[PDB]
From a paper:
[name] is a selective actin histidine methyltransferase that catalyses mono-methylation of actin at histidine 73 (actin H73me) to regulate actin function. [name] belongs to a subclass of protein methyltransferases that in addition to containing the catalytic SET domain, also have a Rubisco-substrate binding (RSB) domain that is present in the plant enzyme RLSMT (Rubisco large subunit methyltransferase). We have previously identified the actin histidine methyltransferase [name] as a critical host factor physically interacting with the viral [name]. Through unbiased genetic screens, we have previously identified [name] as critically important for the replication of a broad range of enteroviruses, including genetically diverse rhinoviruses, coxsackieviruses, poliovirus, and the non-polio enteroviruses EV-D68 and EV-A71, which are associated with severe neuropathogenesis.
We determined the [name]-CV-B3 2A complex structure to 3.5 Å resolution by cryo-electron microscopy (cryo-EM) and observed clear density for residues 22-495 of [name] and 4-141 of 2A protease. CV-B3 2A binds in the pocket formed by the SET domain and the RSB domain of [name], forming two separate interaction interfaces with [name]. The interaction surface areas with the SET domain and the RSB domain, including the linker, are 747 Å2 and 460 Å2, respectively. The linker region connecting the SET domain and the RSB domain contributes two hydrogen bonds/salt bridge contacts between [name] R336 and 2A E74. In contrast, the interaction surface with the SET domain is much larger and includes a small hydrophobic core area centred on interactions between [name] residues Q257 and P259, and 2A residue V59. Additionally, a pair of main-chain main-chain hydrogen bonds between [name] Y288 and 2A H68 form part of an anti-parallel intermolecular β-sheet structure between the two proteins. Although we do not observe any overlap of actin and 2A binding in the [name] active site, actin peptide residues 66-72 and 2A partially overlap in the substrate binding region, forming intermolecular β-sheets with [name] involving [name] residue Y288. Compared to the high-affinity binding between WT [name] and 2A (KD = 47 nM), a single mutation of Y288P in the SET domain (SET288) reduces binding affinity 53-fold (KD = 2.5 µM) and a double mutation in the same domain, SET257+266, 213-fold (KD = 10 µM). In addition, the presence of an actin substrate peptide inhibits the binding of [name] to 2A in vitro. Mutations in the RSB domain interface have only minor effects on 2A binding and no effect on viral replication, while mutations of key contact residues in the SET interface show severely reduced binding affinity to 2A and completely abrogate viral replication.
Author numbering:
A (entry chain A): 22 to 495
B (entry chain B): 4 to 141
The structure:
């Protein structure tokens, strides 16, 4: 333990530092990554392992869940080559049919964590109180480490590894260099490392940790596993009394895969159970899917561990705001405030049509607006009506403002596109020609998706600029 | 309960308001579909400070609590109905979800507290009047 404590302290001291700024962002990452590996290298890996194949434990999950009133009828567990494990129908299922439910007593939740062996520490530590997902991850490890716990039949069917970024090789991460997504990756890695270092110290010293099953061994690998298991599986349910909402892991639900559609999941408070209905008709033998949510591709890769290709909800981040150096700053600020729009914020450029939201359009209409136009939108009772047509695409302020607006956006989108290291044809060529690892494929596909969205934004802005200018001439 | 009770104030959709709320009105906003009136008893809820995009709402037409992810509080078109003309409403969070006219007054929560109340809907999208900046309710 001396080596671990000495390095643990070093890690906490280094990772607690504020970012150095972008010139050293890659550098910060690899330094933490190196130190984390030095620590992980000296540990045995997971404290608790099981000897069978993952699939060999499915019969116990199914038995255990059926004993507690869960739905175990009409579907079974199979290994799909493309996604890995998931549910398959054994009987035909119709859309909106209830096929799955899970009673509250089988769920792993923060509310239940409060009453487990972790309770005494939960109540004292600030992070466990503040971070729902951390308290849930530690509850999961405590149960994993307890051989007679209620959830062993479920914990035993979880995978030993995940494809989220915490499991990426350095050279796989490298493919994301300069993409927007990498900023969120760097943060995720850094925060995970910090949490481990902090808690390792807490378990070793805090007196309420003396009776925990995690007292003898808490490896980096154990923490990484637990955090990943929560973030790739968790959902939100109401608390027992309906007074608040809380994180939960839901056995025999988290085995459903992802596709496009409507949300089919939710919690039935009256009967105290989680429910799910079929998204689409499935014939026996088909893979069962649910909709995970309207998430971006960066979120799916970073938090859920996979890259979904037909992501109709994908987008990129753009930061805009009104300069304080402007002459009309105060007036623009007043119009935006009246409209409920902040002076500066992060907006998004979307994959699907239209490329911009009404809020961004309204923002930009003010951003490019001149003094006279601002007075029209500020002075007079009619001003309020003018302000609430700003997000309405059929109500341009002036042909001049629309041209300035689309010119501005055309240039911003092009400038962002120019910051990438590779171009579109090159990335497509690599994906087609190289026998890449799965993780490398994700990094590249994600990189490509960001460029494709920006290219579309430029083309659309260019067209609108020409359209409005032509109207100006008439 | 179809309304949010914090400190000594009750927050309701303005168009669901009754004469009692108007008599005890302390604040209102046409543009947000909100009316705030006083109470005589202390409430139980909390206005969340958090910068979340995710939470749960009670969908009364389904009698279920659904998780949703939402776009921030931008300016959104609201269709004409028996209470309002077609207009844009400010400070409205948007998510894919289920909402029928009877779902108005349903409450959106995250693990930090209340975020907003169902004000608009139809055709797959549910929209909530954001109440996170009504700091004075506390
Ligand atoms: N349509 C899809 N495409 C690619 N990966 C998917 C997917 N839907 C779900 N996933 C996979 O399933 C995980 C969510 S949990 C679903 C069960 C999982 N296969 C298991 O082994 O327990 C994700 O981390 C990802 O690996
Ligand atoms: Zn929150």
């Amino acid at each position: 333990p001396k080596e671990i404590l000495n390095l643990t302290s070093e890690l906490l001291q280094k990772c607690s530092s504020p970012a150095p700024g972008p010139g050293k962002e890659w550098e910060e990452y690899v330094q933490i990554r190196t130190l984390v590996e030095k620590i992980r290298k000296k540990q045995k890996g997971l404290s608790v392992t099981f000897d069978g194949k993952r699939e060999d434990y499915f019969p116990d999950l199914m038995k255990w869940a059926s004993e507690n009133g869960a739905s175990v009828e009409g579907f079974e567990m199979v290994n799909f080559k493309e996604e890995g494990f998931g549910l398959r129908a054994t009987r035909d299922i119709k859309a909106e049919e209830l096929f799955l439910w899970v009673p509250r007593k089988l769920l792993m939740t923060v509310e239940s964590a409060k009453n487990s062996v972790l309770g005494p520490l939960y109540s004292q530590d600030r992070i466990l109180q503040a971070m729902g997902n951390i308290a849930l991850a530690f509850h999961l490890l405590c149960e994993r480490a307890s051989p007679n716990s209620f959830w062993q039949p479920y914990i035993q069917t979880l995978p030993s590894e995940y494809d989220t970024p915490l499991y990426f090789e350095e050279d796989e991460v490298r493919y994301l260099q300069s993409t927007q997504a990498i900023h969120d990756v760097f943060s995720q890695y850094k925060n995970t490392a910090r949490q481990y270092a902090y808690f390792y110290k807490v378990i070793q010293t805090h007196p309420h940790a003396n009776k925990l099953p995690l007292k003898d061994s808490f490896t980096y690998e154990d923490y990484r596993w637990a955090v990943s298991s929560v973030m790739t599986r968790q959902n939100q349910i109401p608390t027992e009394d309906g007074s608040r909402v809380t994180l939960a892991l839901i056995p025999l639900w988290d085995m459903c895969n992802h596709t496009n559609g409507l949300i089919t999941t939710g919690y039935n408070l009256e009967d105290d159970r989680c429910e799910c209905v079929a998204l689409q008709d499935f014939r026996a033998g088909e893979q069962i899917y649910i909709f995970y949510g309207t998430r971006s591709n960066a979120e799916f890769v970073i938090h859920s561990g996979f890259f979904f290709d037909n992501n109709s909800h994908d987008r990129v981040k753009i930061k805009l705001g009104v300069s304080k150096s402007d002459r009309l700053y105060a007036m623009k600020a007043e119009v935006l405030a009246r409209a409920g729009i902040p002076t500066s914020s992060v907006f998004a450029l979307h994959f699907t049509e239209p490329p911009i939201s009404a809020q961004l359009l309204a923002f930009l209409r003010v951003f490019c607006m001149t003094e006279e136009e601002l007075k029209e939108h500020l002075l007079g009772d009619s001003a309020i009506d003018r302000i609430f047509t700003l997000g309405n695409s059929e109500f341009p302020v002036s042909w001049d403002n629309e041209v300035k607006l689309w010119t501005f956006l055309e240039d911003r989108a092009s400038l962002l596109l120019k910051t990438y290291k590779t171009t579109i044809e090159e990335d497509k060529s690599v994906l087609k020609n190289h026998d890449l690892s799965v993780r490398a494929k994700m990094a590249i596909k994600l990189r490509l998706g960001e460029k494709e969205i920006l290219e579309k934004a430029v083309k659309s802005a260019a067209v609108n600029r020409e359209y409005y200018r032509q109207q100006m001439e008439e | 309960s179809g309304a949010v009770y914090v400190g000594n104030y009750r927050v309701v959709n303005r168009h669901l308001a009754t004469s009692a709320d108007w008599q005890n009105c302390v604040w209102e906003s046409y543009n947000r579909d909100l009316l705030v009136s006083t109470t005589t008893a202390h409430g139980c809820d909390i206005i969340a400070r958090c910068q979340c995009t995710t939470g749960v709402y009670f969908c009364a037409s389904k009698n279920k609590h659904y998780p949703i992810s939402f776009e921030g509080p931008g300016l959104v078109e609201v269709q004409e109905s028996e209470y309002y003309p077609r207009r844009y409403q400010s400070h409205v969070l948007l998510a894919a979800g289920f909402s029928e006219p009877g779902d108005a007054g349903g409450i959106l929560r995250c693990e930090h507290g209340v975020i907003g109340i169902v004000t608009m809907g139809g055709e797959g999208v549910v929209g909530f009047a954001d109440i996170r900046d009504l700091l004075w309710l506390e």
